Every structure is written in structure tokens, then in C-alpha cells.
Design a protein around this ligand. Structure first.
Ligand SMILES: Nc1ncnc2c1ncn2[C@@H]1O[C@H](CSCC[C@H](N)C(=O)O)[C@@H](O)[C@H]1O
Lengths: 166, 385, 408
């Protein structure tokens, strides 16, 4: 890794992260193709920026397409990419998609406790108490421990909804 | 179902990757499981625009939804990989076919032929030809056209004219291809007598109109504003069989025009082809990268594109001006360093703009030029013989 | 064919325990220049549950109630003894070590007490690393006015207590407990450096106790320990248990967490030592320049909640840096590299300014330690403390550099 390659990667990564921060996944795709033309191999960081850009403007299909580009490109997705995907699935209420992403995280030797908590909290926030309860119970029966705040939130919401069983 | 497949097939034939992608997302958003034919259509649509990664992603998604690959999907995959010269992907797909047990038809053989031709592996191309004749099946016009192109590229005039006189004996109305790279190969060795003797028969062409128009315009008789309109209508008429045929037609025409001394005519033909839709990856202009892609072009098409790319550079700054000589798995290897595309581009740039366009220390198939070297930089003289 | 092909501790040390139902499994006691330690005499195979390492009976301990009133378990103090009057006058909150020191002296004076024999293996005044035995010269090398002031306050409190309770008119049974002040100072130092606090149930009574446990104070401290203490109430035995499923190699030291979530300064105040991989150390930054917490964690593979950072170069120093570096988080907002480079440059400048504030460096401190031949234990302890702070700052600098490197 020369200083010239480092500077080119720095400029391209900066501009790509910029385009990801202004909710422009198409611009991130232009930057990725610019890296391809320039000979710079797209690492997990640029692709993570692409995934975040797709997920910021509530686009689940594009985010999963970017993850498919991850797996096709041969790069290992970052934990932040999977966290963004599970958060997007929870915001949209896609509990099964979040579970699939958690399984993929587990296959990639990652700690899925934080993602599980984020998914449960998002499902509760979006008012999907049934799927939130199912995901929480799956995690708890799997040996995973939740925070005190999440326990209290689950108990209070379930009892407010009249769901004594959960 | 029928509407989706029809739209996707039309987009794939016309090289409309964006429309096929939009249709795919819209129809997936309605909880509709895609069929194998629609997936094949979008895959071949992506391959027209040299977007190999998108086509591979779609092919990977094909198995995820339960849609198993078909023969048409493999045919599209080999054709897309052969257009770009990605022969490594070609043999990988061939191994996939051999372990899948599906018989190999003429499409696999000729796709391999032009995959090795575009990659510069002439010896492997003729070896695969002799293997194609060894087993079974009859080559069509496409196979002999591909071998004529590979013979013309690898400075083989004698075998070229032998195949020419052998193929025209079948009363097959020889196409624009044969004439085009025959003029190219005759201009390689300054065979002006052969060029004129071919053009004498070429000009009349009582049977077809396309040959007559192109033969008139190559000599310069159709360069006027009113006389270029006939060429424009014939080009528009030819733009109906698909971008798969359009790219080959433009490649042959550009090679013939460049190698017959008609550099300005080749430049104008490339310019009118760009607005048509052929070669969509040719140019990229932005604050970061100013790129020219030539991995899907021939030697003649590369030189015309490089000539007009250098001229546009001098008009004006991007952080980098790059040349995509080789694109694919060959980049991460020294094999692409020796490739005819890479060496030809390097020699052209070296003898035109001196020692300014250097190689990449990280990629084995790109020609590089930093912004600092751009600061110190009409460069190529385009004239008609 | 068979034909063709740190020192061991005093055997009496374990023998006096062994004859009194102390059992050590798979570990042996070793002694070095630093002090005693417990090491695995063989390869401990990781089992399904925690494995029993040592068993210390309750009757061999010196325990006092952590809360008023003061009741000792086992009750060694006779009714009407003046030592109870001395103990009962202490401050309930801050004077816990004085009561344990009084109990230790009383036990040392008892003929049938076990600690009369076990007390011969305690570190002496010249071997204990507690700062209560440090002079003004040693305290001057801490390079921390706060720690020095705290140590002076502790020493003044201990000496005031001894002067108040060990005057001329005390009975002979009390005067012989501590004839002169430094003996009581050493007793307080031993109590501070080896006391273990736990919630133990005896019979039907559940309470918190301050315990001087033999053979369990032998374990050394670690913030990533392989052993933990579990109290067995049915037979009144304290168990030392290795972590479940954690393989331990032959010769690996047995370590327990003396106290979790405590920085190096409090460790130096209480146990008289510090560690360079303290994952709770704090460096006071200005907070104007901040980096991305998520990227910092992902680059170094630090997972879990902020209270349970762990690693899948990376050690407790990197975790401490992540816990102390100025960080910003915006859920899923990525960081643009350009601001990160400037932020880490400013942070590195701050760290280098802090290093320049120190009169010397860390490598020269290590050289001074290697050339040291006539210095007390507290002298080397203070030198090691300041050197460890210097290495923590240097590790912060290197971590910032490599994080900015791997950001692309
Ligand atoms: N990790 C560590 N590194 C250096 N000293 C340590 C240490 N953990 C504990 N100590 C020292 O050991 C004492 C606890 S009693 C532990 C055994 C003691 N070293 C002996 O030989 O008797 C404390 O005073 C502390 O100064």
C-alpha cells in the first residue's frame, strides 16, 4: 500500500461517505464504480457506506441488494452494516428478515446480543408488540440476556396491552 | 407474468439494464417470486452494459428464490463474459456446465471462441476450434466469423483469405463483418491493391443496401451533410437486432476505418455510436475519475477511442485519468500485464503523450495518470487518407 | 523408550493448611521476588461447569461484620476483652481496616489461633507494597498530588488511632498487641491489602463480612481473571473456582478480580499496585476533538455494551481508551475520514503534551528499575505506576494511529 494509493483511497472514501451522509445511494454507486475503474478494490467500508445510504431513506430492498453485492464481492460485511440492516428491518417490522440477518451475523462469528436488543427495541417502538415479543422470547430462550430497561419495557407494554402470557 | 417477462426480454435485447432493474424491483415489491426466464433477461440486460457484478448478483439471487438456472441463463452468461474478454469466468462457467451434466451446444463453443479471441489467447482459440470439430455439431456463421476475426487480429492474412474464399462459396450473402475485418487485415500490411479489389465488388452490392451504404461512406463519398443522412438511416435500421449485434458491428466498422487510414471517419462513427446506446461504459467524467473502457473493444476500436479520449483531456481537473484495459479476475494477476489490450494501450499512450501514463502498482490491467502528471500534459492527428 | 530419552513454596505453608482441611486441587504455591502466587501445577482441562481449585474452611478466617453491630465469625474475642472496646469506638463507615488490624493483632497474640502460624507467611514491613508504609520520598515519585494527599491522610488517620488507643495506661494484654506504632501500621496495611468482602450465609443468618481469608489472599489480581470466589454455606467453606469452560495451561497463574470497575489510582491506594492493562483508566481530554465510537470498536473488534467491552495489540488498554476517548455517535451516521484524521491528530497532540508534562519517560523508568538495587518496594511501586500511565498514553496514541490507518 503506497502513499499514492492511500491518498486516492482517502479521497474516494471521503467523497463516498459524504454521498452516503446526504442519503444518496446512487451517488455511492457512482463512487464505487469510480473505484472499480481506478483499480481500487471496494472494501467493506465503502460498501458499508452504500448499505447505510440505502437504509437511511427507508429502502430495505436496496440495502439487501447491497449486502448481496457484499457477499458476491467476497468481502466480509462489517458489524455496523448488519446492525443497520437489523435496525431497518425492525423499523419496517420485518421480524423474519431481522432473524435471518441475526443468523447471518452468528455464522460470521459476531456477537448478536446488541443487534438483538436493537431489533427488539425497534419492533416495540414501531408498535409491533407481537413480533417484538416473539423475537425477545427467542433471544431469551437462546441464553441471551437483555438489559433491565428492556425487561421493564417488555413487561409494562405487554401488561398494558393485556398480554399476560408474554 | 407475461408482461413482466416481455418487458424484461425487450430490455435485455435492447441493453436497457436500468429499465429491467426497475421492473425487477417493482415486481419483487409486490411479493411475486421471479421466474427463471425473467431473471435470465435481467442478467443478460446487465451484461450488455458490462455491469458484470450486477449480473453475478442477480445470478446468485436466482438460486436463493428457488429459480434454478436454465440453458438460456448460461448462454447469456457466456456471451456477456466473452464480450468483455473475461475468459477465466468463461472456463469457470464451463466447469459449472461440465459438473451440471448439460450438453454443450454450438453456443458454448463459439462463446468460448470469442472469449479467448477478446482475451488474446489465439492458441487456445484454435485449440478450442479443433476440439469443436473433434466431437460433433456443425459450426454456424458465427463460429467462422469469430475465427476470421481472431485470424485478422493475429496477423494471419493467408488463413484469413483462405477462410474468406471457402465461406463465400456457400452462397451465404457475406455480411458486413467479413468485409470489415478483411479491409482491416489488408490495411495491416498495406495491401491497397487487395483493398481496392474488394471495394470494387463491395460498392455495387445489388442484393443488399447496408453493404452499399457502408462501402460508399468508407471511401468518403457520404461525408456531406445530406450524404451522411443515408448512413444515419441505415445505422438506425441496423439498431433493431440488439446491442449484442450492434457492439460487434461497431467494433468491425471501427477496426476497418482505423486500419484503412480513415481516422476522422472512425472518430465520427464512434461519436454517433455513443449517442445510440452502444458502448455505454466507454466514458466516465467526474471530479474523481476520467476513464475510458476498452476491454470490450478490438484493437482498432481501442485506438479510435483513445484518440478521441486524449483530445478531450487536452481541452480542459479530475484526481485521476485512467484506462480500463483489462477488467475481471485477471486484474489481480500479472497475466493481464502481458495482455494484447494492455500492451497495445500502453504503447499507444507511450508513443503519443510520451512517458506520462504509467501503470498501476495495485492493479494489473489499468493505465494510470495522476493529476500532477495531468497538469504538465489536439493531441492525436485525425486525418483521412 | 524411556531409557533412551520462581521457586516452589515452603511445604509447611500448605501442610499447616492441609492438616486443617485446606485443599488445593491442580495448583501449587510458588514464591518469587515480587511475592507469593498460585500457579497451576498441571493442565486444567475445561469442564462443563466451574472447577474447584481451593477450599478454605471458615474456622481458619478472621471475619468481622461489615455493618453495625460488630460481630466476629468465628467468635474469637472473649466477653469483656478491652480489644472489643477499642474496636467498637471506630467509625462504622471508614474505619473498617482498623477493626481488622485489631483482630489480626489479637489473633497473632492468641496461642491456639491458626493465624499465629499463617502470619509468618504474610509480607513483612519491607516486603508489603501498601502505600501506608511509603515514606515522603517514595510518595514524591507518584507524580500525582491527589494520591499523595490521600496516602498522607490515611497514614495520619492510622497513627492518630494508634496514639489514641495505645497510650501508656492500656493493660498489658493490649500493649503487647502493638508495642510501637509501625507494627499497627503494618497490621493496617496487611488488612487493607488482603481483606476480602463478601455476602456469606452462616446457618440462617445472611450478612456482609470483611474477611481475612488464608490461602485466598494468595491469589493475584487481574481484570481478566480465570478464577472467582464462591462461598459454600452448607459446610461453611470458601471455594476458589476456575471459570467454566476456560482452559488453563500448566504454570498459568491463578488470578481473581480484587475489585471491578476501579482505576489504577484506587488500586494503588488500596492494594498498593497498578496494572498497565487497566480497562477503566481515565485520561482527562478537552473533549473538543472526538472520534467515532462504532468505527473504533469495529476496527479493534471490541463488542458488547459500554459496561461489558471485550475483545474477540488489542488489550485492556484499548478498551480503556475506547471508554475514555471523546466519542460521538449518531445511530447509523458514518464518519467522513477527513475529520477523523484531524481529530486523532489533536488527540495525539494532547497525549504528547501530557507525556511532556511528566519530567521523565517510560523507557528511562524501566531502565531505572533494571538498575535499581537499594530501593524499597513502594519506590518501585510508584515508578511502575507512573510508567504504566505513560504506557497507557502511548498505547492510546498507537491505537489512534492504527485506527486512522484502517479507516479506509
Ligand atoms: N497483578 C499484580 N501485580 C503486582 N502485584 C500484585 C498484583 N496483584 C496483587 N499484587 C500485590 O499482592 C498483594 C496481595 S496479597 C497477594 C500475594 C502477595 N504478593 C504475597 O506474596 O504475599 C497486594 O499488596 C498487591 O500489592
Amino acid at each position: 500500500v503506497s502513499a499514492l494509493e492511500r491518498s486516492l483511497r482517502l479521497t474516494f472514501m471521503d467523497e463516498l461517505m459524504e454521498r452516503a451522509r446526504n442519503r444518496d445511494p446512487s451517488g455511492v454507486s457512482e463512487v464505487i464504480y469510480d473505484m472499480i475503474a481506478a483499480g481500487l478494490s471496494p472494501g467493506p467500508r465503502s460498501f458499508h457506506g452504500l448499505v447505510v445510504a440505502h437504509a437511511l431513506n427507508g429502502d430495505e430492498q436496496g440495502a439487501m441488494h447491497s449486502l448481496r453485492k457484499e457477499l458476491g464481492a467476497g468481502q466480509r460485511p462489517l458489524p455496523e452494516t448488519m446492525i443497520a440492516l437489523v435496525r431497518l428491518s425492525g423499523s419496517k417490522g420485518n421480524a423474519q428478515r431481522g432473524l435471518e440477518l441475526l443468523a447471518a451475523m452468528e455464522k460470521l462469528n459476531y456477537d448478536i446480543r446488541q443487534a438483538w436488543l436493537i431489533l427488539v427495541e425497534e419492533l416495540v417502538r414501531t408498535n409491533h408488540l407481537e413480533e417484538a415479543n416473539k423475537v425477545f422470547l427467542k433471544g431469551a430462550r437462546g441464553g441471551m440476556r437483555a438489559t433491565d430497561q428492556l425487561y421493564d419495557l417488555m413487561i409494562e407494554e405487554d401488561c398494558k396491552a393485556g398480554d399476560h402470557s408474554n | 407474468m407475461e408482461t413482466y417477462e416481455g418487458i424484461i426480454f425487450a430490455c435485455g435485447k435492447g441493453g436497457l439494464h436500468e429499465d429491467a432493474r426497475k421492473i425487477l424491483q417493482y415486481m419483487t415489491a409486490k411479493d411475486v417470486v421471479p421466474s427463471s426466464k425473467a431473471y435470465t433477461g435481467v442478467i443478460e440486460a446487465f451484461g450488455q452494459a458490462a455491469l458484470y457484478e450486477e449480473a453475478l448478483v442477480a445470478f446468485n439471487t436466482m438460486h436463493e428464490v428457488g429459480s434454478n438456472p436454465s440453458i438460456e441463463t448460461f448462454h447469456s452468461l457466456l456471451y456477456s463474459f466473452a464480450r468483455g474478454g473475461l475468459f477465466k469466468e468463461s472456463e469457470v462457467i464451463l466447469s459449472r456446465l461440465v459438473n451440471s451434466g448439460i450438453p454443450r451446444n454450438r453456443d458454448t463453443f463459439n462463446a468460448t471462441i470469442e472469449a479467448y479471441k477478446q482475451g488474446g489467447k489465439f492458441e487456445e482459440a484454435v485449440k478450442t476450434y479443433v476440439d469443436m470439430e473433434k466431437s460433433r455439431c456443425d459450426p454456424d456463421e458465427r463460429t467462422l466469423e469469430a475465427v476470421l476475426s481472431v485470424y485478422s487480429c493475429a496477423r494471419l492474412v493467408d488463413e484469413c483469405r483462405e477462410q474468406f474464399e471457402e465461406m463465400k462459396a456457400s452462397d451465404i450473402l457475406p455480411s458486413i463483418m467479413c468485409y470489415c475485418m478483411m479491409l482491416s487485415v489488408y490495411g495491416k500490411t498495406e495491401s491497397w491493391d487487395d483493398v481496392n479489389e474488394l471495394l470494387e465488388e463491395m460498392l455495387s452490392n445489388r442484393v443488399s443496401n447496408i453493404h452499399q451504404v457502408i462501402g460508399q461512406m468508407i471511401k468518403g463519398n457520404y461525408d456531406d451533410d445530406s450524404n451522411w443522412q443515408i448512413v444515419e438511416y441505415v445505422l438506425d435500421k441496423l439498431n433493431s437486432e440488439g446491442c449484442g449485434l450492434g457492439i460487434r458491428f461497431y467494433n468491425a466498422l471501427l477496426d476497418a476505418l482505423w486500419w484503412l487510414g480513415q481516422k476522422e471517419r472512425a472518430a465520427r462513427v464512434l461519436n454517433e455510436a455513443t449517442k445510440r446506446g452502444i458502448f455505454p461504459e466507454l466514458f466516465r467524467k467526474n471530479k474523481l475519475v476520467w476513464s475510458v473502457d476498452v476491454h470490450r473493444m478490438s484493437e482498432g476500436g481501442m485506438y479510435t477511442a483513445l484518440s478521441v479520449w486524449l483530445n478531450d483531456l487536452s481541452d480542459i481537473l479530475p484526481q485521476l485519468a485512467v484506462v480500463v484495459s483489462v477488467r475481471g479476475q485477471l486484474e489481480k494477476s500479472s497475466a493481464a500485464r502481458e495482455s494484447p489490450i494492455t500492451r497495445a494501450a500502453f504503447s499507444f499512450l507511450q508513443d503519443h503523450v510520451s512517458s506520462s501514463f504509467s501503470f498501476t502498482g495495485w492493479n494489473g490491467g489499468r493505465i494510470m495518470c495522476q493529476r500532477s502528471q495531468l497538469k504538465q500534459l489536439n493531441i492525436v492527428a485525425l486525418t483521412n487518407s | 523408550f524411556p531409557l533412551f530419552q520462581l521457586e516452589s513454596a515452603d511445604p509447611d505453608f500448605y501442610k499447616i493448611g492441609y492438616v486443617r482441611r485446606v485443599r488445593a486441587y491442580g495448583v501449587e504455591f510458588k514464591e518469587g521476588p515480587d511475592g507469593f502466587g498460585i500457579y497451576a501445577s498441571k493442565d486444567i482441562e475445561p469442564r462443563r461447569r466451574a472447577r474447584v481449585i481451593m477450599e478454605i474452611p471458615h474456622e481458619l478466617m478472621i471475619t468481622i461484620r461489615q455493618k453495625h453491630p460488630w460481630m466476629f465469625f468465628p467468635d474469637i474475642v472473649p466477653i469483656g476483652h478491652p480489644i472489643f472496646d477499642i474496636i467498637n469506638s471506630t467509625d462504622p463507615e471508614r474505619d473498617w481496616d482498623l477493626r481488622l488490624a485489631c483482630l489480626l493483632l489479637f489473633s497473632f497474640d492468641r496461642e491456639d489461633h491458626f493465624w499465629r502460624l499463617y502470619g509468618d507467611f504474610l509480607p513483612a514491613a519491607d516486603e508489603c507494597s501498601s502505600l501506608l508504609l511509603a515514606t515522603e520520598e517514595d510518595l514524591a515519585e507518584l507524580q500525582d498530588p491527589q494520591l499523595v494527599s490521600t496516602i498522607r491522610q490515611q497514614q495520619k488517620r492510622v497513627l492518630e488511632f494508634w496514639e489514641k488507643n495505645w497510650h501508656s495506661g492500656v493493660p498489658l494484654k493490649i500493649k503487647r498487641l502493638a508495642e510501637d506504632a509501625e507494627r499497627f501500621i503494618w497490621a493496617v496495611s496487611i488488612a487493607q491489602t488482603r481483606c476480602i468482602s463478601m455476602k456469606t450465609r452462616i446457618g440462617a443468618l445472611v450478612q456482609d463480612l470483611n474477611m481475612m481469608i488464608p490461602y485466598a489472599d494468595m491469589l493475584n489480581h487481574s481484570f481478566e481473571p480465570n478464577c472467582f470466589l464462591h462461598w459454600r454455606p452448607k459446610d461453611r467453606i470458601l471455594e476458589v473456582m476456575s471459570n467454566a469452560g476456560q482452559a488453563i495451561k500448566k504454570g498459568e497463574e491463578m488470578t481473581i478480580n480484587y475489585m471491578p470497575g476501579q482505576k489504577n489510582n484506587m488500586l494503588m491506594e488500596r492494594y498498593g499496585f497498578s496494572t498497565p492493562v487497566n480497562p477503566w483508566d481515565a485520561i482527562p481530554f478537552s473533549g473538543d476533538s472526538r472520534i467515532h465510537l462504532n468505527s473504533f470498536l469495529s476496527v479493534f473488534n471490541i463488542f458488547g455494551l459500554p459496561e461489558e467491552y471485550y475483545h474477540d495489540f488489542v488489550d485492556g488498554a484499548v478498551i480503556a481508551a475506547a471508554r475514555t476517548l471523546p466519542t460521538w455517535s449518531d445511530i447509523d451516521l458514518p464518519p467522513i475520514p477527513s475529520a477523523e484524521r484531524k481529530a486523532v491528530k489533536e488527540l495525539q497532540d494532547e497525549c504528547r503534551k501530557m507525556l511532556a508534562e511528566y519530567p521523565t519517560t517510560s523507557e528511562q523508568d524501566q531502565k531505572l528499575l533494571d538498575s535499581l538495587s537499594e530501593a524499597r518496594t513502594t519506590f518501585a511501586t510508584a515508578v511502575k505506576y507512573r510508567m504504566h500511565r505513560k504506557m497507557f498514553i502511548g498505547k492510546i496514541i498507537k491505537a489512534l494511529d492504527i485506527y486512522q490507518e484502517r479507516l479506509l
